[PDB]
Design a protein around this ligand. Structure first.
Ligand code: NAG
Lengths: 49, 35, 49, 98
């Protein structure tokens, strides 16, 4: 419901779970979706610490 | 082993060590018996 | 593809004595030559085809 | 018979050749661990992460570095080979004359 100011930006740590990134990428609701160091179509194949 | 795994191989000598020893002993026999 | 680690080769049972924390082994070329299977916790050797 | 059996350094000239060649190969293999400016030294990491345009940039960096490493190796082997050939020519001369 509430987002932070940019100077006081929030951070959430995510771990020990299954991440489906296609539900976000294939959404019609986001004006910007830009990936660096990785391609969005490959995110579902990857594992991160 | 791991060198092979990266495209690095070793080719065997045409003459084996046994064959080289045979050449050497032939040279020795020649020298000893016929100068 | 072992927990994100991809490659090609022949897999076999290993005699390598991994400690519980260890997940994989490496050679001098920085290539993984052994992995722990994430489900069975079995140690496997990886050799090229 | 007795001297060779009690002198660890007797065959240094031959051992040095073995050691120099081993060192050159070990160096060549170790260069595969270098990034050369790429995101990873591992080609499979690059291909699993990036699409072909961005991937081609990272791969080109590895190709440049790895080609340079191989050229360095080969040049050194050619120079070393010449030295060995000179030694072999001398050995052949001694076989004939001694
Ligand atoms: C799930 O993985 C764990 C090891 O992390 C293993 O002990 C367990 O038996 C696995 N469950 C199934 C159904 O394979």
């Amino acid at each position: 419901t509430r987002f932070a100011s940019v100077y006081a930006w929030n951070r959430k740590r995510i771990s020990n779970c299954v991440a489906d990134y296609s539900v976000l990428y294939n959404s019609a609701s986001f004006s910007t979706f830009k990936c660096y160091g990785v391609s969005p179509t490959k995110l579902n194949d990857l594992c991160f610490t | 082993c791991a060198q092979k795994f990266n495209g690095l191989t070793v080719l065997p000598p045409l003459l084996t060590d046994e064959m080289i020893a045979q050449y050497t002993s032939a040279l020795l026999a020649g020298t000893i018996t016929s100068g | 593809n072992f927990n994100g680690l991809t490659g090609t080769g022949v897999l076999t049972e290993s005699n390598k004595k991994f400690l519980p924390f260890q997940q994989f082994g490496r050679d001098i070329a920085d290539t993984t030559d052994a992995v722990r299977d994430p489900q069975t916790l079995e140690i496997l050797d990886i050799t090229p085809c | 018979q007795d001297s060779l059996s009690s002198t660890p350094s007797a065959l240094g000239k031959l051992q040095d050749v073995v050691n120099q060649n081993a060192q050159a190969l070990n160096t060549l293999v170790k260069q595969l661990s270098s990034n050369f400016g790429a995101i990873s030294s591992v080609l499979n990491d690059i291909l699993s992460r990036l699409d072909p345009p961005e991937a081609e940039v990272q791969i080109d960096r590895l190709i440049t570095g790895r080609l340079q490493s191989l050229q360095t190796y080969v040049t050194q082997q050619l120079i070393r080979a010449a030295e060995i050939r000179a030694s072999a020519n001398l050995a052949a001369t001694k076989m004939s004359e001694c």
